[PDB]
Design a protein around this ligand. Sequence first.
Ligand SMILES: C=C(C)[C@@H]1CC[C@]2(C)O[C@@H]2C1
Ligand SMILES: C=C(C)[C@@H]1CC[C@]2(C)O[C@@H]2C1
Ligand SMILES: C=C(C)[C@@H]1CC[C@]2(C)O[C@@H]2C1
Ligand SMILES: C=C(C)[C@@H]1CC[C@]2(C)O[C@@H]2C1
Ligand SMILES: [Cl-]
Ligand SMILES: [Cl-]
Ligand SMILES: [Cl-]
Ligand SMILES: [Cl-]
Lengths: 289, 287
Amino acid sequence: EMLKHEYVKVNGIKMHYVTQGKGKLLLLLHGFPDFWYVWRFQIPALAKHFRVVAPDLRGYNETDKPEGVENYRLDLLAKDILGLIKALGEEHAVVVGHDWGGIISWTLTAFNPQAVEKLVILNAPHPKAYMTRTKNSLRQLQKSWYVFFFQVANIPEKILSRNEFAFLKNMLIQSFVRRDLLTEEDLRIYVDAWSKSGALTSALNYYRANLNPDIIFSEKTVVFPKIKVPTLVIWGEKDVAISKDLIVNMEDFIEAPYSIKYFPECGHWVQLEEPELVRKHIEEFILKS
Amino acid sequence: MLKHEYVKVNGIKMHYVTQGKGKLLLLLHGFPDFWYVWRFQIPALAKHFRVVAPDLRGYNETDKPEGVENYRLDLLAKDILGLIKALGEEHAVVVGHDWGGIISWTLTAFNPQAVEKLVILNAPHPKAYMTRTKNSLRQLQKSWYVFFFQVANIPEKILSRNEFAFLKNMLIQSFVRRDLLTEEDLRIYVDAWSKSGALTSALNYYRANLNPDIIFSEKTVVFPKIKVPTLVIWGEKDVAISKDLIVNMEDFIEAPYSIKYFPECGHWVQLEEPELVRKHIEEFILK
Ligand SMILES: C=C(C)[C@@H]1CC[C@]2(C)O[C@@H]2C1
Ligand SMILES: C=C(C)[C@@H]1CC[C@]2(C)O[C@@H]2C1
Ligand SMILES: C=C(C)[C@@H]1CC[C@]2(C)O[C@@H]2C1
Ligand SMILES: C=C(C)[C@@H]1CC[C@]2(C)O[C@@H]2C1
Ligand SMILES: [Cl-]
Ligand SMILES: [Cl-]
Ligand SMILES: [Cl-]
Ligand SMILES: [Cl-]
């Protein structure tokens, strides 16, 4: 087996992905400020049992980057993944999502349960949990200072990209509980992906479209179907972006059986900090029902 | 007793309350307050001084020019310099809380001749916040709302809806005493917040002086040292300001300086320990 790079048209966007292995379709979905490469430690080990597919989401790295904030609404992002499953000649997939990848995964599974065999979430709060609780959590509103910063046009792009993405590199390094987690080669690979024309604006449009102050402080109740697919939630407790207030009491959101695996000595990038334990928990969940 | 007055300063009409006679003593409020934040200090300080508590540009009964550019710190300090002159004085003892304190630091640094003594209550030195915020995760987190306030119209709508419920809650959460504000106090605050254009004007202070360009500026700040006797009163349980921004204030002051820490107080130290605050201010001026 060897890691192959492919491109496929889904809805109206050309999506890039890396793939390795054969068997059940296993999707690995990254978040901000990542791309398929965040899954580097899981792809070869998982490919021993599955047909592993790690795509670049809409607006990231090698995938198409439509213009406009409205093109980054969660509904369209979940439809890209649904479209990806179909384009890969499958009816369903095991879906693993981290950060934005996780928010998209929760959305895909709630609105299209038939397309998701099993759901794996890594440090990604349930959309109804964040929509309901953020406005009522001072600690969460504080952790989300940058979500408000990202609302502003052009200025965050400028601040984040200047001096070879120094601000972005620093904010990333500060989020890790592990020392020197990114090598100089890793940083050079991330800077290449970050530098793709229109990538940063597109990545920031996820916050502008789905996490603007109107949505955060909405008085309207959220229409979100219960999760009806077996779910595994992995949570690195030392998360600098997400409060525990947003992960507790998932009972009212998940009807199907579910499990929560807490990593008390890990942060937001649990798949980078404990790559083998994360890979093992994912494998065991799928292969042992 | 307490008298309400209006006076022309620069190109704006400024409202203020005044009580007492003697040395001119200015009390400057911040966000989301007005002269009324000084209710517990005005009658006691009037006993020895000519107390003047104005409503800053854009607040309550004072003129509210339209546009973000009309709320730059340079213009706000010039309003106070102008207010000193309009009251028939050369100088004043300046006491500033929050934005009032930021204005006071600015007035004292660029016009020392207009300030007899300085009193700062939970207001970081402008050079301290401009330099240190971008380097303090804890401060950037505490300042989530500064970023929220950058957005047009949406913060005004969220803050004012349901009779300013969001504003009332964020204010109550900032106090170290659960039932500090009475139902009457809250209706007095809602009246001042409801003044036509008041909320937008108050939010324009953040848009003009604390936008992301300023916070993450690579350029160093030109700010003269404080050459006037300075007293700093600080409530340590401040939800808006990290201690990182208040440490090493001596490197900004080339004059007598003293700092009184209130470990069991928050941002509204003048409301939480009104007598102790009044006493520290009185003792500093009269000695
Ligand atoms: C807790 C949050 C507001 C955020 C939601 C969006 C993102 C990418 O998943 C992180 C945490
Ligand atoms: C660039 C940033 C301000 C953010 C900081 C927090 C988080 C979760 O790590 C991302 C990038
Ligand atoms: C410390 C901060 C970034 C701000 C500065 C402005 C104000 C009124 O004092 C509050 C908090
Ligand atoms: C209403 C708000 C968002 C803020 C919350 C924090 C602070 C210092 O109390 C002010 C008002
Ligand atoms: Cl690539
Ligand atoms: Cl752990
Ligand atoms: Cl009044
Ligand atoms: Cl105290």
